[PDB]
Amino acid sequence: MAFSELLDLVGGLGRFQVLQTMALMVSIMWLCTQSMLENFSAAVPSHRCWAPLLDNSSPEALLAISIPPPHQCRRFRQPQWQLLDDTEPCVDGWVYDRSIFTSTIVAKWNLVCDSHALKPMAQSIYLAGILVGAAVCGPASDRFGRRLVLTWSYLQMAVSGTAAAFAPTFPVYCLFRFLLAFAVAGVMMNTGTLLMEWTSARARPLVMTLNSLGFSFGHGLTAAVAYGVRDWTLLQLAVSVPFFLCFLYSWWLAESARWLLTTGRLDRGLQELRRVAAINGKRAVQDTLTPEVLLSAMRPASLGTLLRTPGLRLRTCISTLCWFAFGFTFFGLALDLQALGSNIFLLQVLIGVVDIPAKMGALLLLSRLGRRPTLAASLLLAGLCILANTLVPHEMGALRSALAVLGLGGVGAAFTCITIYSSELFPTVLRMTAVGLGQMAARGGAILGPLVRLLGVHGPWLPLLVYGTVPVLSGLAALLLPETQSLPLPDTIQDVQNQ
Template identity: 35%
Template sequence: MSGTGELLKAAGDFGPFQKWLLVLASLPCFSLSFHQFCQLFMVPDVPHHCDTSWIRALGPNLTEEEQLNLTVPRGPSGEYEQCSMYSPVEWDLDSIVAYGLNATQECSSGWVYPADHEETLVIQNVSVHLNDVFQYSLTMGVATVFAFGDILNALGEFGRFQKWLVVLLSLPVPLTAFHMLGQLFMLVDVPHYCDTSWIRALGPNLTEEEQLNLTVPRGPSGEYEQCSMYSPVEWDLDSIVAYGLNATQKCSSGWVYPSTQTPSLLTEFDLVCDKKDLNDISQAVYMLGLLLGAMFFGPLSDRIGRRPVVLVSMLIQGLFGVAIAFVPDFYVYMAFRCVVGASMSGITMTILALAMEWVGVSYRPHAVLLSHCCFAIGQMILAGLSYGIRNWRLLQIAGSVPIFALFFYFWVLPESARWLMTKGRIEEAKKILQKAASINKRTIPPGLLEQLKPEAQTKPGSTMDLFRKKHLRKVTLIMLCTWFANSLVYYGISLNVTNFGLDIYLTQLAFGAVEIPARASCIWFLQWFGRKKSQGFLLLLSGLVCLIITGIPEDQPVVITVLAVIGKFATSASFSASYVYTAELFPTVVRQTGAGLCNMSARVAGIIAPLIRLLGRYHRAVPMAIFGSAPVLAGLLCFLLPETRGMDLVDDTSAAAPQHRSPENTNRTSENGHVKAKGGGPDKECAETTYF
């Protein structure tokens, strides 16, 4: 560590490079004041009273003042109460006027605000507690006069435009695998013992073995202790050799790593003994970044769009990913990794939404699972890259710099036309749709484009809608459990790659390789067995495999690794299924908010997973038993969800579930015949939307 300080002095403590880096790192700070205090101006107090429109059914000609006088009590100051109303009764209007109302209650049907006040977050009636956490989760939806699936029919459900878009969105995915799992190869455990160079002052000619024999105690196995040493004494060397040392203590002068040739996180920051747990804690901090990113970027992409969130997330990941390679302290390393984790959530969540909203119903799984296969390829690349580059700083740079090659996205990445429609930006949606149709060599009928206009403003979709509506509440709670269990078992297996007993690079290669058939076979599972059964059975399989591992002896590393690979197969396929299933279950106006909540649940599990590994010090079977129990329970809950195979995406929260596409919609044909099924009748076309 002292060598790093000397290098910094030689390079210059605060030269142009450091000044440039400081200025660059300070740029995001300008927006911090906005995000810190902007809510103060979004939630100003405005006059309001309970919505008592129930009395309009009895007296439709009542003036507003008469309605308030009959249904809202007055306070001590003579003003109408803002948070209470008279309880509705089943009397006629004459009886209410004659006898009046006495019983009061809290507002049960919302509030009314004067028409001269602009809309604010308060007027949108957001829960105060959720407003503190999800203040950007509101999405202003616009009802359209036809299903967006009709446009995709005319456009082509998976033409050249969509194929090009899916490939484009898959390019950053291999890099996310590096940031997710790269630390496993930067913190590989190596032999070490206490630095006992104090004895060199007494015997400068001692060999390394003689020094260890005199100053480091041996454990029950006969090996030198790694975290303790004999206490230094003021004897001469002959006395130490003759009488030996007895009193022991913890390492007080650092550690020595005799077999290490290149610096790693472990050797550079001494992450051994009392600091050993920082390895798992740093992984938990990274997962915390994923959680914060899910909380922030999910609602943000619903508000400002998919494209800007992807671009901003890529920039953050690139800058902080490279900056990690230059950190002088492990705690700074963990802080930067947290930021990188947040940006990764922004990338993965938003490219999922963008792909799902451009691709037709029959090809949604293909689009999502292709990006997941790219994540598996990234894991395989990580195994080779970490094997060839052992210096952790160079490895970090090699895994972070390639993201900058993707900034041509600024000119070529399109916005989601479906999102533009829900925001009322119809002209922009038309331009993008026409461009996509020209790339697909299709023609969208002019009459269909003319219908692409807002009809009426719908109630804004918000986080509360996920729990206020009964059908969405059940879906949300079960999917939260599903994502939690998926994430727990996935990271429980993936982060344990160094403890299965075989070569870590080969094991990582196998883990990456098995994910490709797992992700690809998921398409087949979803096609033939449906979303619900596939999700449930894959979770059950991954959990049962982990439970079996708990009973395998430690001296059977091959058996344990084979079972772990099977578990990795099942949980990878289950994770892919959950991405598709989640996007199909939630309506457009709250899709990213719902996906954000599910990601939050997964990230909570990701935070817990490395901490659960610490329980292995009490019994090695405890972590795997926990990793196996959660997916078994979640798999059983999945059978309570509705099936979404072959159904159109729902745009607002009023529908109870995704709806099957009607034969009329499916066979709607443009003048040039581009939409018509090749095989003919309605029955066949409906089947083609159900099966791939």
């Protein structure tokens, strides 16, 4: 089933591939904005208990007499006039700090100091959504299309985001964040695969790196939009409309002809190849793509076949392990830069600006070393920066922050290498199912991150020890799965079993 011959008869690396890469990178930027805006639409302001002597009838002088030390969950039922020289719970409302953020979900639904474990839970739900999303968008994309799921996931992202921007109660907001996360999983996996299966190997790592840099630039776009737009409602709506645009233009993409011709469909694959030839101006071969030529090229995915198949069991388990390590470390480390600076937008900008050169260096490394050595190196670096950060004598001059940022760079490199490795490591029949299993593992790691952060009671170093031991062991396990370079993309189980 030789497809690179067809990608060369048709336009390879033509204007179609670059246009698709740009559009999908932009959509990924907006998707990262959706994912990372829980730091801005759910930011916790400086709150206190609504007291009769403050907000009814000096601030600093009249606040010390009406709120015990300022406590965010209790207030003096009756102020003690013998305090300038007997408490009560926060039953009068709340008063938030509306100077940095005009409004957020935390301030809107009073998720403070008694329901404080609802801001993380909501985030967890989002992660859970992506998990479930993969479980229903991985196999589905392997049965109905790489682009059909992408288009309907764009539409679902737009609709769910616009509905969450107008949620009247917290459960409705959580439900629509869950549905948005479902569509987010669909979009991420289908975008990665669709870029994987339309670019010739010459510039396949490059376009996958551009797609991954989509998230890196979305980390800065989040800060830009959240700086321009402060209210959580307007922020969510302004991030969700771009996905209405993405769904609108997503009908001009081409269904991945590798998947199309891999399955029993041939007229659809022929039409997509002819359209791609017409887009990038291939004159003679547009009509010389007759079904005779396609036959001369010589060309049910429900998570129940992938994880039990003799041909690929080490591949799936190790790839999902590396995905889990990436999710674990990345979502335990994204919020770990708070010690670098107090500013909140600068942290998002910093994450983007340290993932950009990390992914460029990973692209160079994998185009020089190879997928497996570079993945092992990136995971080992990301998992050993933490195990060395836990040994720093805490002078935080030029060692603590350096390791903290090298860990993030290694995590970004690991992600941009594991996307390529997982896409190239599985047959086109099970490519999206396996990438969906990887996304489920990554979201499971992200969910379990804060849960294992609770180990600080038994030891200040145990959470860091786990957060660094998982990537080290995953990278040392990423030296067992087979190398995938100068090998054509497998598009059936027999192709993998041939290797």
